[PDB]
Design a protein around this ligand. Structure first.
Ligand SMILES: [Mg+2]
Ligand SMILES: [Mg+2]
Ligand SMILES: [Mg+2]
Ligand SMILES: [Mg+2]
Ligand SMILES: [Mg+2]
Ligand SMILES: [Mg+2]
Ligand SMILES: [Mg+2]
Ligand SMILES: [Mg+2]
Ligand SMILES: [Mg+2]
Ligand SMILES: [Mg+2]
Ligand SMILES: [Mg+2]
Ligand SMILES: [Mg+2]
Lengths: 110, 155, 107, 41, 166, 97, 101
RNA sequence: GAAAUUGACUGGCGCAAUAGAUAUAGUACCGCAAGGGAAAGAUGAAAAAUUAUAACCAAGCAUAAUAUAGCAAGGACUAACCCCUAUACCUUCUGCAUAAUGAAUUAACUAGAAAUAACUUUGCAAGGAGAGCCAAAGCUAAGACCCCCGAAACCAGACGA
């Protein structure tokens, strides 16, 4: 009998040292000899792409979806995707967290 | 007939704020709530407890200001009426029928905390003049004079 | 037909507009459903347009009830004890905005 | 007998609610009523 | 079929406050499936509407109709149930508030005509309904007086307005 | 009055039966199974209506041609009469010629 | 249209007036102004310096539904339509005159 | 209207008491006979609970007859009428308020079926289609178009003096 871990949230705040951590990661995965434009190195090799994306996913808790994996052509793009924040909440909570005027009342009978 | 409080969609603080805003008056919130709380509602709710501030000061202030201010408007616009006629016009404007009609179509009854529904006309008149007293305490004599001018000379 | 329906004379609520204008709309109750394709337009209206309407009309209390229903509705309560129940079933967001504004300007 | 009409009551009653204040059988019998509501409009 | 007249008899009321009128007793009775026409029974009921109970019994006793005898029996048993179960004080202190006749369940028989022709006979049946109310019979409405006629004419003349103008 | 006085009893449907959960499976058996089979031989029904559409007269002709021999006497008589009527109607009546 | 208005009056305009409710506007094309003991007559319009009318948009509503039915007999001709005309209720507040004759 | 030749179980986008079998039944009833041929029933877990809260809904009536004047209304109006306007409907027709047709009214049932092409939208394309067929942009697939009732008659086999 295997226990199931509790359900993870999709809330992902982009960390402040995303630049320096991406530097660390690209350094162990693509080797010590960096091209000066580390921005613009290709991800055409699927093994190198798997290693980089899997390391980033296991660190940051955020995984690139299958509909964006083909888009993930450069670590430029990978930096863009991990820069983009995604947010998880019920939208009843979203409508409440939006600054409601005092004459508007929301009830959630669900 | 059942009161709008026991009718489903209701929120008392929102209704009080909308009352002040749709009357375009900067009411004090606690003063308005105490102007809507009546003594009979007080007595019914201790009785329910065995199984705070009333209208009276605000009602008396609003009533006295209504008499004085209405008499002032009437005898300034019509200098030739004698005192009996000015007094009778003032008693008509602060009478039961006119004040209850104004309170009902301004929805003082919906916000009135009382014992019986429909609200008895004496209770509704007292609640309306407590609202007048709250407006006098919150805004000032000229502003509540404009309020009285509108909502009674229009009658 | 005039002979088959009631009639009345032109009137205001309490001599409205003489001293000051009082908005006769008091309450708006929006029954909307989370999962209803009929309620999609009202869902968009609650998402985008109800905040600005509530800010523009501070004298009106707006309740929004998200509950499982097939026909989304709006109930407008007016100061003289009037109640108007209207179906916003399968209406776009601009049609709902036009209707809710029209209810606001009614007596 | 698939696909019978089930809201014939409501169609009859919208014509009859326009015909309600008439005199005779034309305020309640649908045939005579619908011949008169049209003329009224 | 429906028996709401009997259920009306079995309706009950809350207890009375000591400071309000006495709420006079109401007694509902009916007879069903009377071998008689509802129109003729209507003539008898319209005769005994609004009478006192004894006045109705006298009129039905000296009328010459089968419906009159049947209605007399129904009135007697309604009076008996009135002062036996509904706490009517005096058996003469009742009047007929409602008295009407309805259609009953009829039967279709053939009526042989000439040639090969035929008709359908209707073995007509009817119901009789009565309501007895405790108290003296209400006074008949007095006929309209010339003073009242002049008054209503003056009221129309004073209710006239200037139409289709400001 | 032609209308119910009470609500009809609720018509609950299981959207996840065997039949609904597995509707449509193997409908691409020809183009995903080296064309050894056909959907027209996936179809189960009457023996004269397996992979064939037709209008009414064609259906009646096909039924009489295929299962005419092993058919009941009055059913075959009604089928002969129906074919005769449908022939007359389709070849002799209508708006367009 | 020509409206004979006074102060504290109500009129019903049969179209929308692109104004918010409770909005104070000035009516200008004054054909006539008058009191007891005197009237002033424009030719055909009075001076805007001479007379002002003040009105207030107090209601923006719709009319009751109007039926348009067309019927021609023995020709199967039968047509129904429902219209709701927009309307605007104005309260005439004040009528002011200035000494300019 | 050919042929040679080719090769080929246990469910319901059914009905639910005017429907679905005519069927509760070939019974009742009708006819000498062959033969024709119906209608309908609805409580509850318990009726060894006959009770009383079930209604509300067609036509028809009752509660509750009527008041100068006129297709029965509409414009209206303080006001039901009084004032003003106004030649029922369908079919048929050159043309019908027609004193031409049909209809007492209510409920239910009761009348547009498809090819050849064309057009629109896809797929593939000098080829298209899961053989066969068509092809000087075509072929394949789908969509979309063709009613109901009624004679006097004619023939076959029975049943009847
Ligand atoms: Mg049957
Ligand atoms: Mg049958
Ligand atoms: Mg009826
Ligand atoms: Mg006339
Ligand atoms: Mg002719
Ligand atoms: Mg003519
Ligand atoms: Mg005639
Ligand atoms: Mg003739
Ligand atoms: Mg005729
Ligand atoms: Mg003819
Ligand atoms: Mg011949
Ligand atoms: Mg012989």
């Amino acid at each position: 009998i295997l226990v199931c871990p509790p359900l993870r949230s999709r809330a992902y705040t982009p960390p402040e040292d995303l630049q320096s951590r991406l530097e660390s990661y690209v350094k162990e995965v693509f080797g010590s000899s960096l091209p000066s434009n580390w921005q613009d190195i290709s991800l055409e090799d699927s093994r190198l792409k798997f290693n980089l994306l899997a390391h980033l996913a296991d660190d940051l808790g955020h995984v690139v979806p299958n509909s964006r994996l083909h888009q993930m052509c450069r670590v430029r793009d990978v930096l863009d995707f991990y820069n983009v924040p995604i947010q998880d909440r019920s939208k009843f909570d979203e409508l409440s967290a939006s600054n409601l005027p005092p004459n508007l009342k929301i009830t959630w009978s669900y | 007939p059942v009161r709008r409080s026991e009718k489903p969609n209701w929120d008392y603080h929102a209704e009080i704020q909308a009352f002040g805003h749709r009357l375009q008056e900067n009411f004090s919130l606690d003063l308005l709530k105490t102007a809507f709380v009546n003594s009979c509602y007080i007595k019914s709710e201790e009785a329910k407890r065995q199984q705070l501030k009333s209208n009276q000061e605000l009602s008396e202030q609003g009533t006295s200001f209504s008499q004085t201010c209405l008499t002032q408007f009437l005898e300034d616009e019509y200098p030739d009426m004698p005192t009996e006629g000015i007094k009778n016009l003032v008693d008509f404007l602060t009478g039961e029928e006119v004040v209850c009609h104004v309170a009902r179509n301004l929805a003082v009854e919906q916000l009135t905390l009382s014992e019986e529904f429909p609200v008895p006309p004496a209770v509704l008149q007292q609640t309306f003049f407590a609202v007048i007293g709250a407006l006098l305490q919150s805004s000032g004599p000229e502003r509540t004079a404009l309020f009285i001018r509108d909502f009674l000379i229009t009658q | 037909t005039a002979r088959g329906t009631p009639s009345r004379f032109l009137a205001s609520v309490l001599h409205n507009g003489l001293g000051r204008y009082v908005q006769q709309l008091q309450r708006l109750s929006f029954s909307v459903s989370r999962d209803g394709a009929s309620s999609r337009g009202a869902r968009e209206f609650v998402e985008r347009e109800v905040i600005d309407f509530a800010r523009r009309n501070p004298g009106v209390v707006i309740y929004v009830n998200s509950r499982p229903c097939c026909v989304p509705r709006v109930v407008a309560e007016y100061l003289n004890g009037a109640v108007r129940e209207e179906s916003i079933h399968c209406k776009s967001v601009e049609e709902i905005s036009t209707l809710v504004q029209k209810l606001a300007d009614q007596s | 007998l698939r696909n019978r009409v089930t809201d014939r009551y409501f169609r009859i009653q919208e014509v009859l609610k326009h015909a309600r204040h008439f005199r005779g059988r034309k305020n309640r019998c649908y045939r005579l009523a619908v011949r008169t509501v049209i003329r009224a409009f | 079929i429906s028996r709401k007249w009997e259920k009306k008899n079995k309706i009950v009321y809350p207890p009375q406050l000591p400071g309000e009128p006495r709420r006079p007793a109401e007694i509902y009775h009916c007879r069903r499936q009377i071998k008689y026409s509802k129109d003729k029974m209507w003539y008898l009921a319209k005769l005994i509407r609004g009478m006192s109970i004894d006045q109705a019994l006298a009129q039905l006793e000296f009328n010459d109709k089968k419906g009159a005898k049947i209605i007399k029996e129904v009135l007697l048993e309604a009076q008996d149930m009135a002062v036996r179960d509904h706490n009517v004080e005096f058996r003469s202190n009742l009047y007929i508030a409602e008295s009407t006749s309805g259609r009953g369940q009829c039967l279709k028989r053939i009526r042989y005509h000439g040639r090969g022709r035929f008709g359908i006979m209707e073995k007509v049946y009817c119901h009789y309904f009565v309501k007895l109310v405790e108290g003296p019979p209400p006074p008949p409405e007095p006929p309209k007086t010339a003073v009242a006629h002049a008054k209503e004419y003056i009221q129309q003349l004073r209710s006239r307005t200037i139409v289709h103008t400001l | 009055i032609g209308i119910r006085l009470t609500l009809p009893p609720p018509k609950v449907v299981d959207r996840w039966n065997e039949k609904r959960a597995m509707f449509g499976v193997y409908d691409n058996i020809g183009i995903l199974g080296n064309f050894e089979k056909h959907p027209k031989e996936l179809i189960r029904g009457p023996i004269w209506l397996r992979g064939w559409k037709g209008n009414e007269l064609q259906r009646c002709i096909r039924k009489r041609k295929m299962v005419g021999s092993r058919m009941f006497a009055d059913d075959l008589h009604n089928l002969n009469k129906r074919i005769r009527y449908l022939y007359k109607h389709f070849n002799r009546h209508g708006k367009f010629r | 249209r020509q409206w004979k208005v006074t102060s504290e009056d109500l009129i019903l305009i049969g179209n929308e007036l692109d104004l918010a409710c409770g909005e104070r506007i000035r009516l200008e094309k004054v054909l006539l102004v008058g009191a007891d003991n005197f009237t002033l007559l424009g030719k055909p319009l009075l001076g805007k310096d001479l007379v002002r009318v003040e009105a207030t948009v107090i209601e923006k509503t719709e009319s009751w539904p109007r039926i348009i039915m067309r019927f021609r007999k023995r020709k199967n001709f039968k047509k129904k339509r429902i219209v709701t005309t927009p309307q605007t209720v104005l309260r005439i507040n004040s009528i002011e005159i200035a000494p300019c004759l």
